Amino acid sequence: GAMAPSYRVKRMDIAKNDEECVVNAANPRGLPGDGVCKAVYKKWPESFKNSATPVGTAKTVMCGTYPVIHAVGPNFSNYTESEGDRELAAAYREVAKEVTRLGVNSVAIPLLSTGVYSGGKDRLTQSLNHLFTAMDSTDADVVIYCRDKEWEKKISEAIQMRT
Ligand SMILES: NC(=O)c1cc(Cl)ccc1N
Ligand SMILES: [Cl-]
Ligand SMILES: [Cl-]
Ligand SMILES: [Cl-]
């Protein structure tokens, strides 16, 4: 466990994280993909061996001794708002189980379903709130990675509002 488990946000490539494991915003088929998934494929390509897993699940594959947790958020282009919301909640619950199983003291995590899988909507608050519901009961340091300057500000304010 971390000595005083914390949330932090950084605006940078998750492939340069300083944490003990990474969460990939994966597709269900274990393909190289785009955005976070493409950066993760370039940095840890060995982790894509048998990484296919269903929507709403997470599957960990080791790159050497470094764990890559492939977490599959719903594509809101295909899911109803209702079903998509349930699968996005479920994907983060499976990340919390894997983080706990691995015994890591820190994890790098992107906001699932907020890019190509967003169905054209702003899902910062929806995705971040499902991240908190899952990770609040874990004692790993959680470092959230984003690329937009306005998103960094809003994530930081959300963390600070809980004090
Ligand atoms: N590689 C990343 O950290 C990243 C890339 C995109 Cl396009 C969006 C969010 C991210 N965290
Ligand atoms: Cl960067
Ligand atoms: Cl996405
Ligand atoms: Cl972002």
PDB file of C-alpha atoms and ligand atoms in Angstrom:
ATOM      1  CA  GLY A   1       0.000   0.000   0.000  1.00  0.00           C
ATOM      2  CA  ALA A   2       0.964   3.693  -0.425  1.00  0.00           C
ATOM      3  CA  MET A   3       1.777   5.501   2.918  1.00  0.00           C
ATOM      4  CA  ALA A   4      -0.975   8.150   2.350  1.00  0.00           C
ATOM      5  CA  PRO A   5      -2.931   6.992  -0.721  1.00  0.00           C
ATOM      6  CA  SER A   6      -3.518  10.022  -3.036  1.00  0.00           C
ATOM      7  CA  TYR A   7      -5.074  11.037  -6.378  1.00  0.00           C
ATOM      8  CA  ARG A   8      -3.070  13.228  -8.781  1.00  0.00           C
ATOM      9  CA  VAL A   9      -3.513  14.395 -12.394  1.00  0.00           C
ATOM     10  CA  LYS A  10      -0.791  14.997 -15.017  1.00  0.00           C
ATOM     11  CA  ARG A  11      -1.098  16.284 -18.607  1.00  0.00           C
ATOM     12  CA  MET A  12       1.408  14.126 -20.520  1.00  0.00           C
ATOM     13  CA  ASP A  13       1.793  10.803 -22.410  1.00  0.00           C
ATOM     14  CA  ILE A  14       0.793   7.866 -20.070  1.00  0.00           C
ATOM     15  CA  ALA A  15       3.616   5.893 -21.868  1.00  0.00           C
ATOM     16  CA  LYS A  16       6.095   8.118 -19.813  1.00  0.00           C
ATOM     17  CA  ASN A  17       4.329   7.412 -16.455  1.00  0.00           C
ATOM     18  CA  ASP A  18       6.358   7.123 -13.153  1.00  0.00           C
ATOM     19  CA  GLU A  19       3.996   4.495 -11.587  1.00  0.00           C
ATOM     20  CA  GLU A  20       4.311   0.727 -10.875  1.00  0.00           C
ATOM     21  CA  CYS A  21       1.737  -0.285 -13.563  1.00  0.00           C
ATOM     22  CA  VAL A  22      -0.382   1.213 -16.364  1.00  0.00           C
ATOM     23  CA  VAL A  23      -4.053   0.925 -17.383  1.00  0.00           C
ATOM     24  CA  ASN A  24      -4.511   0.771 -21.171  1.00  0.00           C
ATOM     25  CA  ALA A  25      -7.745   2.183 -22.662  1.00  0.00           C
ATOM     26  CA  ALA A  26      -7.963  -1.005 -24.782  1.00  0.00           C
ATOM     27  CA  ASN A  27     -10.235  -2.314 -27.487  1.00  0.00           C
ATOM     28  CA  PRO A  28     -11.923  -5.711 -26.966  1.00  0.00           C
ATOM     29  CA  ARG A  29      -9.770  -7.430 -29.645  1.00  0.00           C
ATOM     30  CA  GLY A  30      -6.291  -6.640 -28.281  1.00  0.00           C
ATOM     31  CA  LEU A  31      -5.433  -4.539 -31.398  1.00  0.00           C
ATOM     32  CA  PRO A  32      -2.945  -1.606 -31.444  1.00  0.00           C
ATOM     33  CA  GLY A  33      -5.824   0.936 -31.710  1.00  0.00           C
ATOM     34  CA  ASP A  34      -5.434   4.776 -31.403  1.00  0.00           C
ATOM     35  CA  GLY A  35      -4.840   7.509 -28.763  1.00  0.00           C
ATOM     36  CA  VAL A  36      -3.735   5.992 -25.356  1.00  0.00           C
ATOM     37  CA  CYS A  37      -3.890   2.433 -26.847  1.00  0.00           C
ATOM     38  CA  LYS A  38      -1.419   3.320 -29.696  1.00  0.00           C
ATOM     39  CA  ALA A  39       1.065   4.904 -27.197  1.00  0.00           C
ATOM     40  CA  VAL A  40       0.732   1.780 -24.974  1.00  0.00           C
ATOM     41  CA  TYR A  41       1.310  -0.549 -28.015  1.00  0.00           C
ATOM     42  CA  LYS A  42       4.514   1.394 -28.978  1.00  0.00           C
ATOM     43  CA  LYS A  43       5.882   1.304 -25.387  1.00  0.00           C
ATOM     44  CA  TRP A  44       4.805  -2.226 -24.225  1.00  0.00           C
ATOM     45  CA  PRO A  45       4.034  -4.244 -27.406  1.00  0.00           C
ATOM     46  CA  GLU A  46       4.794  -7.559 -25.610  1.00  0.00           C
ATOM     47  CA  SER A  47       1.736  -6.823 -23.359  1.00  0.00           C
ATOM     48  CA  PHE A  48      -0.643  -7.343 -26.376  1.00  0.00           C
ATOM     49  CA  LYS A  49      -0.051 -11.152 -26.369  1.00  0.00           C
ATOM     50  CA  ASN A  50      -3.566 -12.614 -25.800  1.00  0.00           C
ATOM     51  CA  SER A  51      -4.866  -9.285 -24.392  1.00  0.00           C
ATOM     52  CA  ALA A  52      -8.381  -9.559 -26.018  1.00  0.00           C
ATOM     53  CA  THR A  53     -11.111  -9.249 -23.335  1.00  0.00           C
ATOM     54  CA  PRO A  54     -14.813  -8.246 -23.380  1.00  0.00           C
ATOM     55  CA  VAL A  55     -16.337  -4.783 -22.828  1.00  0.00           C
ATOM     56  CA  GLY A  56     -16.613  -4.009 -19.082  1.00  0.00           C
ATOM     57  CA  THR A  57     -13.556  -6.214 -18.152  1.00  0.00           C
ATOM     58  CA  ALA A  58      -9.832  -5.802 -17.545  1.00  0.00           C
ATOM     59  CA  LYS A  59      -7.097  -8.290 -18.430  1.00  0.00           C
ATOM     60  CA  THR A  60      -3.491  -7.896 -17.185  1.00  0.00           C
ATOM     61  CA  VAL A  61      -0.517  -8.949 -19.360  1.00  0.00           C
ATOM     62  CA  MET A  62       3.106  -8.521 -18.118  1.00  0.00           C
ATOM     63  CA  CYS A  63       5.751  -6.686 -20.223  1.00  0.00           C
ATOM     64  CA  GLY A  64       8.810  -8.103 -18.463  1.00  0.00           C
ATOM     65  CA  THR A  65       7.783  -7.511 -14.792  1.00  0.00           C
ATOM     66  CA  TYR A  66       5.800  -4.293 -15.642  1.00  0.00           C
ATOM     67  CA  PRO A  67       1.983  -4.925 -15.534  1.00  0.00           C
ATOM     68  CA  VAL A  68      -0.263  -3.589 -18.337  1.00  0.00           C
ATOM     69  CA  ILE A  69      -3.944  -3.715 -17.288  1.00  0.00           C
ATOM     70  CA  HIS A  70      -6.052  -3.738 -20.528  1.00  0.00           C
ATOM     71  CA  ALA A  71      -9.385  -2.113 -19.498  1.00  0.00           C
ATOM     72  CA  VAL A  72     -12.210  -2.153 -22.106  1.00  0.00           C
ATOM     73  CA  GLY A  73     -14.659   0.768 -21.845  1.00  0.00           C
ATOM     74  CA  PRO A  74     -17.857   0.789 -23.942  1.00  0.00           C
ATOM     75  CA  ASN A  75     -17.990   2.657 -27.278  1.00  0.00           C
ATOM     76  CA  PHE A  76     -21.011   5.013 -26.736  1.00  0.00           C
ATOM     77  CA  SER A  77     -21.565   4.981 -30.562  1.00  0.00           C
ATOM     78  CA  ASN A  78     -22.928   1.389 -30.044  1.00  0.00           C
ATOM     79  CA  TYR A  79     -24.242   1.235 -26.456  1.00  0.00           C
ATOM     80  CA  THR A  80     -27.334   3.047 -25.123  1.00  0.00           C
ATOM     81  CA  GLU A  81     -26.474   5.765 -22.529  1.00  0.00           C
ATOM     82  CA  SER A  82     -27.919   3.363 -19.885  1.00  0.00           C
ATOM     83  CA  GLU A  83     -25.992   0.194 -20.915  1.00  0.00           C
ATOM     84  CA  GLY A  84     -22.790   2.170 -21.704  1.00  0.00           C
ATOM     85  CA  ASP A  85     -22.905   3.755 -18.218  1.00  0.00           C
ATOM     86  CA  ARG A  86     -23.162   0.228 -16.600  1.00  0.00           C
ATOM     87  CA  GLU A  87     -20.232  -1.162 -18.714  1.00  0.00           C
ATOM     88  CA  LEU A  88     -18.031   1.932 -17.979  1.00  0.00           C
ATOM     89  CA  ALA A  89     -18.661   1.482 -14.186  1.00  0.00           C
ATOM     90  CA  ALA A  90     -17.906  -2.280 -14.539  1.00  0.00           C
ATOM     91  CA  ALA A  91     -14.590  -1.721 -16.458  1.00  0.00           C
ATOM     92  CA  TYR A  92     -13.243   0.479 -13.595  1.00  0.00           C
ATOM     93  CA  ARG A  93     -14.402  -2.072 -10.919  1.00  0.00           C
ATOM     94  CA  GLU A  94     -12.283  -4.754 -12.762  1.00  0.00           C
ATOM     95  CA  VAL A  95      -9.263  -2.331 -12.800  1.00  0.00           C
ATOM     96  CA  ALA A  96      -9.556  -1.970  -8.971  1.00  0.00           C
ATOM     97  CA  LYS A  97      -9.545  -5.831  -8.601  1.00  0.00           C
ATOM     98  CA  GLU A  98      -6.408  -6.132 -10.813  1.00  0.00           C
ATOM     99  CA  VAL A  99      -4.540  -3.240  -9.081  1.00  0.00           C
ATOM    100  CA  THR A 100      -5.294  -4.944  -5.716  1.00  0.00           C
ATOM    101  CA  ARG A 101      -4.265  -8.459  -6.975  1.00  0.00           C
ATOM    102  CA  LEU A 102      -0.904  -7.156  -8.353  1.00  0.00           C
ATOM    103  CA  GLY A 103       0.015  -5.570  -4.978  1.00  0.00           C
ATOM    104  CA  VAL A 104       1.308  -2.339  -6.662  1.00  0.00           C
ATOM    105  CA  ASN A 105       1.747   0.884  -4.633  1.00  0.00           C
ATOM    106  CA  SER A 106       0.852   3.124  -7.646  1.00  0.00           C
ATOM    107  CA  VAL A 107      -1.069   3.016 -10.979  1.00  0.00           C
ATOM    108  CA  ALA A 108      -1.246   5.283 -14.078  1.00  0.00           C
ATOM    109  CA  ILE A 109      -4.867   5.485 -15.403  1.00  0.00           C
ATOM    110  CA  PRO A 110      -6.557   7.270 -18.348  1.00  0.00           C
ATOM    111  CA  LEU A 111     -10.251   8.334 -18.396  1.00  0.00           C
ATOM    112  CA  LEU A 112     -11.998   5.373 -20.148  1.00  0.00           C
ATOM    113  CA  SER A 113     -14.549   6.084 -22.936  1.00  0.00           C
ATOM    114  CA  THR A 114     -13.658   9.872 -23.174  1.00  0.00           C
ATOM    115  CA  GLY A 115     -12.005   9.864 -26.679  1.00  0.00           C
ATOM    116  CA  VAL A 116     -12.902   7.764 -29.807  1.00  0.00           C
ATOM    117  CA  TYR A 117     -15.379   5.747 -27.566  1.00  0.00           C
ATOM    118  CA  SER A 118     -17.239   8.931 -26.257  1.00  0.00           C
ATOM    119  CA  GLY A 119     -20.012   8.904 -28.952  1.00  0.00           C
ATOM    120  CA  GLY A 120     -19.177  12.633 -29.535  1.00  0.00           C
ATOM    121  CA  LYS A 121     -20.023  13.723 -25.919  1.00  0.00           C
ATOM    122  CA  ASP A 122     -17.985  15.259 -23.041  1.00  0.00           C
ATOM    123  CA  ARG A 123     -17.771  12.368 -20.474  1.00  0.00           C
ATOM    124  CA  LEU A 124     -15.069  13.855 -18.130  1.00  0.00           C
ATOM    125  CA  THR A 125     -17.375  13.868 -15.026  1.00  0.00           C
ATOM    126  CA  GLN A 126     -19.112  10.523 -15.870  1.00  0.00           C
ATOM    127  CA  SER A 127     -15.800   8.623 -16.412  1.00  0.00           C
ATOM    128  CA  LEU A 128     -13.913  10.320 -13.515  1.00  0.00           C
ATOM    129  CA  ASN A 129     -16.810   9.565 -11.069  1.00  0.00           C
ATOM    130  CA  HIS A 130     -16.799   5.848 -12.073  1.00  0.00           C
ATOM    131  CA  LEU A 131     -12.958   5.870 -11.599  1.00  0.00           C
ATOM    132  CA  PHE A 132     -13.405   7.262  -8.029  1.00  0.00           C
ATOM    133  CA  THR A 133     -16.213   4.758  -7.130  1.00  0.00           C
ATOM    134  CA  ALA A 134     -13.882   1.825  -8.064  1.00  0.00           C
ATOM    135  CA  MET A 135     -10.496   3.148  -6.842  1.00  0.00           C
ATOM    136  CA  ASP A 136     -11.599   4.848  -3.541  1.00  0.00           C
ATOM    137  CA  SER A 137     -11.356   1.489  -1.683  1.00  0.00           C
ATOM    138  CA  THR A 138      -7.814   0.729  -3.034  1.00  0.00           C
ATOM    139  CA  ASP A 139      -4.594   2.026  -1.330  1.00  0.00           C
ATOM    140  CA  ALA A 140      -2.510   2.525  -4.526  1.00  0.00           C
ATOM    141  CA  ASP A 141      -1.452   6.094  -5.435  1.00  0.00           C
ATOM    142  CA  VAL A 142      -3.618   6.865  -8.526  1.00  0.00           C
ATOM    143  CA  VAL A 143      -2.139   9.188 -11.161  1.00  0.00           C
ATOM    144  CA  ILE A 144      -4.724  10.167 -13.857  1.00  0.00           C
ATOM    145  CA  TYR A 145      -3.258  11.039 -17.326  1.00  0.00           C
ATOM    146  CA  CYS A 146      -4.927  13.483 -19.769  1.00  0.00           C
ATOM    147  CA  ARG A 147      -3.831  15.508 -22.868  1.00  0.00           C
ATOM    148  CA  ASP A 148      -6.230  18.579 -22.890  1.00  0.00           C
ATOM    149  CA  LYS A 149      -5.323  21.692 -20.720  1.00  0.00           C
ATOM    150  CA  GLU A 150      -9.010  22.410 -19.784  1.00  0.00           C
ATOM    151  CA  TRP A 151      -9.531  18.709 -18.820  1.00  0.00           C
ATOM    152  CA  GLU A 152      -6.401  18.890 -16.558  1.00  0.00           C
ATOM    153  CA  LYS A 153      -7.899  21.933 -14.740  1.00  0.00           C
ATOM    154  CA  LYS A 154     -11.345  20.221 -14.267  1.00  0.00           C
ATOM    155  CA  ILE A 155      -9.824  16.895 -13.088  1.00  0.00           C
ATOM    156  CA  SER A 156      -7.568  18.783 -10.592  1.00  0.00           C
ATOM    157  CA  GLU A 157     -10.610  20.770  -9.252  1.00  0.00           C
ATOM    158  CA  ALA A 158     -12.633  17.500  -8.887  1.00  0.00           C
ATOM    159  CA  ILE A 159      -9.759  15.884  -6.877  1.00  0.00           C
ATOM    160  CA  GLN A 160      -9.391  19.036  -4.678  1.00  0.00           C
ATOM    161  CA  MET A 161     -13.221  19.284  -4.034  1.00  0.00           C
ATOM    162  CA  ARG A 162     -13.006  15.943  -2.057  1.00  0.00           C
ATOM    163  CA  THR A 163     -10.061  17.744  -0.259  1.00  0.00           C
TER     164      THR A 163
HETATM  165  N1  LIG B   1      -1.134   8.828 -24.283  1.00  0.00           N
HETATM  166  C1  LIG B   1      -1.844   9.522 -23.403  1.00  0.00           C
HETATM  167  O1  LIG B   1      -1.451   9.711 -22.247  1.00  0.00           O
HETATM  168  C2  LIG B   1      -3.160  10.085 -23.842  1.00  0.00           C
HETATM  169  C3  LIG B   1      -3.432  10.291 -25.201  1.00  0.00           C
HETATM  170  C4  LIG B   1      -4.657  10.802 -25.590  1.00  0.00           C
HETATM  171 CL1  LIG B   1      -4.969  11.051 -27.287  1.00  0.00          CL
HETATM  172  C5  LIG B   1      -5.630  11.119 -24.672  1.00  0.00           C
HETATM  173  C6  LIG B   1      -5.377  10.920 -23.327  1.00  0.00           C
HETATM  174  C7  LIG B   1      -4.151  10.406 -22.876  1.00  0.00           C
HETATM  175  N2  LIG B   1      -3.954  10.220 -21.531  1.00  0.00           N
HETATM  176 CL    CL B   2       4.331  14.110 -23.208  1.00  0.00          CL
HETATM  177 CL    CL B   3     -11.737   6.290 -25.639  1.00  0.00          CL
HETATM  178 CL    CL B   4      -7.782  14.595 -22.364  1.00  0.00          CL
END
